[PDB]
Amino acid sequence: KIYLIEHVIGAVAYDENGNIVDYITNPRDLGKITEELLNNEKGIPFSATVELLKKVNPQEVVVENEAEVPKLQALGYRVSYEPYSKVSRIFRESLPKVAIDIKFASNEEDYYNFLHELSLEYTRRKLRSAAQKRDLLAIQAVRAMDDIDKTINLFSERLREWYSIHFPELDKLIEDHEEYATIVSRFGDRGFLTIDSLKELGFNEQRINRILDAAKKSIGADISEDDLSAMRMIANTILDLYNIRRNLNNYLEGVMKEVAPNVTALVGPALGARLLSIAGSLDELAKMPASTIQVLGAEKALFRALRSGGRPPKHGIIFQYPAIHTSPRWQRGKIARALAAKLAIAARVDAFSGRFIGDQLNEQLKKRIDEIKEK
Amino acid sequence: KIYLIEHVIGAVAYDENGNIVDYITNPRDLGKITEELLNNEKGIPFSATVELLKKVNPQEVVVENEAEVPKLQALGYRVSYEPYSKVSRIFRESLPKVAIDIKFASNEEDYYNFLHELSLEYTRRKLRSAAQKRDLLAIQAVRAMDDIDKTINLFSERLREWYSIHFPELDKLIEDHEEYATIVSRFGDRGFLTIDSLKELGFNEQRINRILDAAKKSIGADISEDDLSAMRMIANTILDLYNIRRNLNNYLEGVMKEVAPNVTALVGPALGARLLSIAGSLDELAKMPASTIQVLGAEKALFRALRSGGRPPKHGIIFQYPAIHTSPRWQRGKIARALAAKLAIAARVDAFSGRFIGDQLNEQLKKRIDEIKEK
Amino acid sequence: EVITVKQTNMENIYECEFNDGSFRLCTRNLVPNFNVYGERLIKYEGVEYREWNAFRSKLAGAILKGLKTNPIRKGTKVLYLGAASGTTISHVSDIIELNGKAYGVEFSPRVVRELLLVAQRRPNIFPLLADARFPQSYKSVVENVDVLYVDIAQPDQTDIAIYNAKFFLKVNGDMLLVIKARSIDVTKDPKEIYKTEVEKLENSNFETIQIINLDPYDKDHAIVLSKYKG
Amino acid sequence: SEVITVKQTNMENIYECEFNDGSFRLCTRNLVPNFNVYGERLIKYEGVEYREWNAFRSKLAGAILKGLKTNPIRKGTKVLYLGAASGTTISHVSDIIELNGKAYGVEFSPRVVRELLLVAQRRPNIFPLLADARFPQSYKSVVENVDVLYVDIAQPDQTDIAIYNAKFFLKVNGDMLLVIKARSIDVTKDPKEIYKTEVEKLENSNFETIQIINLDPYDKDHAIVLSKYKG
RNA sequence: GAGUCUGAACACUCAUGGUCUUCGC
RNA sequence: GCGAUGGAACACUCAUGGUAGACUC
RNA sequence: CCAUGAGUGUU
RNA sequence: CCAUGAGUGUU
Ligand SMILES: Nc1ncnc2c1ncn2[C@@H]1O[C@H](CSCC[C@H](N)C(=O)O)[C@@H](O)[C@H]1O
Ligand SMILES: Nc1ncnc2c1ncn2[C@@H]1O[C@H](CSCC[C@H](N)C(=O)O)[C@@H](O)[C@H]1O
């Protein structure tokens, strides 16, 4: 009976054949119209639409946005939805002129000048809202934390080669990078090593014995203090990086408990945030089926196999989940499919703000993994 | 006519048919024998050999190591060199018994016990001498500097993405990573930016007003102080890394002016050390032809073009030389060939400690470059 | 250095000869002294032109591979799906001039952040941070257009294009559709994909006009020109 | 995985271990009980410790799996090992030849000999020589002549280096095990052509060809040739 | 559209080789 | 072997899409 | 880049 | 991994 048109222009009521029945023009306010476009996206009718229908008292209203149908029905109207109707094309083909007739704009230039500021303002607001989503902070943080891990390993490999020129035996004696960098930072010249100074740093007596024995037998070269100091710059940097790594990990814990507590209950904050990073957002993660979640991070292996026909990957980044990588190869598929199943549930509960069930998801999984290990 | 055998066990004089004319047995001293073995590979005869030849008064002496011929001649003997002589094979096939006959050892087990300790001490002293080479230090330092460069860039790219959540327009306004990191470190919330604080850091008025204007109108999100502090941890690490980079580059200048001054005169300490790093050592670098030096660092393109017949690379890491990478592509080949040719000469001057001609090599090269560009 | 700039066979698309022998496509700059993506600004007989890199712009590539007729001309109204950071739509804005209109749809906020810089200086460009699958989310801003230009990485890109045409493309208007084969099905041969997607179009009442392979300007890409019959 | 049994094979002091997963793996008797070299598994069976021998990391184990008919490395054997690297394969050679055998290990990269030195410190069997195989006049003052010359060096002229070391140190009628590394000789050529060219050079230097074994898949672009030195 | 089952997660460091074409002497 | 000439230096960041095989309902 | 040897990090 | 868009470092 009546076709409702909602546009920057205002609200316009049309017949079956395209004749304007009546209209209410929007104010020429950028703030007001953007707010109403944002509202209208979640189905809220323009306030100009509410005044229009109250005046036109229509028998049946055809709208163009499906989410708007319940909103108008709750006002007491008979409402149907119609996509790309003939009438709304007829309306769109009569712009910019119809904006002059209904007196939103004085001429074509005036109309398009306003429309241009409108699109900018609309876009700026949708950019601000996207930037407010707090899952972006978890994602950047865990990406930075992974950069730091990689850097710690890169610099520690370099320091071991560089310092082994002066004390090569230490490399194989100290497996822990942070301890190795501690020894190089604190002492430099292997001649400065002693029981008390090593004890003071927290080494136990057997370890201290192996170290002082190696330092005394050492086949390494004699280098200068300046040479040692170039090496200690790397060691100190490594120590600083571990401190940042631990801060970032504590930061990430608080954000992930806030942003995705159910996922965090299952996999912890770091691995939870890596799932977000690869998905791109919590909302994206919560659309994925378990079988996609299962291989997030394995895109190289998956597409290599999808081409060559070779063997597909059993797991992506969730391989970091201890019960996956510390179990035998033949159990890993099944465990990864059990975890992916609970991740998919946890992500939906988090994305829709459902009630926290993460601890129960964990129990269900631990017990399901127990079933599997009987293999 | 005498075949001189020099072995761990001592000096043996053989006649042409494998019969022992006389011998002088080394002392059972690991340190002494090891030192005499090291001198000997350089052609210096054993002290036992000197004693032996005076006893035997040979008419002619056949030696196993060619480097030894001039040294024994300087003692007044007629001397020749024979590779893998029959007599020396007869000596070696009579071990370990001959070691018992000349009373170097009581029995087989005694001989091999000592031989084993000898081989360890010999190998230990060569490992020490290898580690003492000064070019190892330049190679490690420039490698750590390149990790640092890579890391600075990786963290800066991450910081920009991260801080852009809060202040997105700053990314395109501040192109230098150290300045971007400086702004994030110092202020955090873009609200804290004032004219005079920015002046303090050295920015100029035109830039400062663009920054403050962008911060007022920013569509970035509002985030907590704790969210900003996580970002600032990456910023301050970036600034520490730039300081390390500069200290390392100053260290590398000292080492390279001492280790390869002629190479350093042509390409600077950092690029010169990269050449050492890819070649593996100054000695290896000085064996290479110009055409190989020209493409050090481009092994990927080189072997791709060998295996496919494609176009080979015109330059490797020397692409970093400003006259190459700031020049039009049709000149780079000629320019790189001219530089590689001077580097080959320079590497040999440094490796064999000739007189410094780096200033002159550089003058020759820059004249050749002027000729090329004026085609 | 610039020998000469003369208009090519297509309205408001120019060609510049350089003294080193080179030839490059260019458009008259709507915003003099400002570049969009680091392209060269060319001055000739008073007028400033922007060189139009065909290795970065599918429309420039299509022209250098033999695009016969170009529906994008002066005063054209364009719905641009996949506006991205502004590279191609900035040249579209040059060609169409102040009385044409380019509605730019792009759903990635990270890249619309850059597109907004381009749009701010061009009263020609209306950026819409929106999902092309849902034309109901920007029908309130746009109008009906002469040209629908679609370059979105989606597996149902052709269906999305068709859906926007039913909303917004005038009958007898034109569609330029980029077919991104590795984004439709990476396992299939692009030649098959092109055949399949054009079949869709002709089944949806789009008269095929010309199909252009974009190699070497783009690997595994084609671009289709069709007239929408209604 | 659990060991069913370990039985001696055709070749002396080389054993084959059986696992209940139906898989078999070569192993040797550990000359130094309770120590590993490169993380290999220590296997206890009927009171004797064995070391699993991974054919993917050892050319000699791989050759046995790919059908080596006779093995000159037995107990008491004297061997010159060119290319001893960090000690993987030579540690097993050490187990096979036992305390009365001798393995002289030549390796010229100091970075890797740092590691070889640790293997040798525990094995009186093994005499590590940081030395260039092109310069046998260096280590002639330490070694002796040998029954087996084992050569695994990445050098374009590895075969000529093997032949030249043989004239110094390999007994007449002794044996040479020469790994042919096709990609370190010439990446542009087909490995099968490399092998015929290298074997031809050996036969031209009075080496009698006993067996030529292609080492795929334990090592790609690799052959190994067992030859008898005629003098 | 669900389900079960099968099933190649990523990121890196060091060491040794393999270094073109053409045209001239 | 020498020369001239020809000639694809490397290291990375973000955004969009492409997500398997069997069997069961 | 290819082949070979030895290792590291997310663990 | 592939294709596409935008960029950074050694400079
Ligand atoms: N459903 C969708 N709605 C809007 N944009 C989409 C989309 N799906 C993909 N895109 C966008 O399509 C773009 C493909 S890149 C296209 C480049 C652009 N046409 C130019 O002129 O240079 C990406 O920016 C991507 O974010
Ligand atoms: N000229 C030479 N002299 C001594 N060793 C050499 C050499 N040329 C190459 N090599 C060494 O040969 C080795 C090849 S890797 C060999 C691995 C070892 N044989 C094993 O199976 O465990 C490298 O360590 C290399 O340093």
Tab-separated table of C-alpha atoms in Angstrom, chain A residues 161 164 168 171-172 217, chain D residues 111 114-115 117-118 121:
chain	number	residue	atom	x	y	z
A	161	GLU	CA	77.970	-17.973	19.199
A	164	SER	CA	81.555	-19.020	22.884
A	168	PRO	CA	82.741	-22.157	24.442
A	171	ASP	CA	76.990	-23.102	25.840
A	172	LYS	CA	76.359	-26.819	26.383
A	217	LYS	CA	89.862	-25.778	31.588
D	111	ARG	CA	83.234	-24.552	15.104
D	114	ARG	CA	84.558	-27.954	19.522
D	115	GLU	CA	81.785	-30.574	19.704
D	117	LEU	CA	86.323	-32.878	21.082
D	118	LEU	CA	83.720	-33.848	23.713
D	121	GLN	CA	87.409	-37.013	25.366
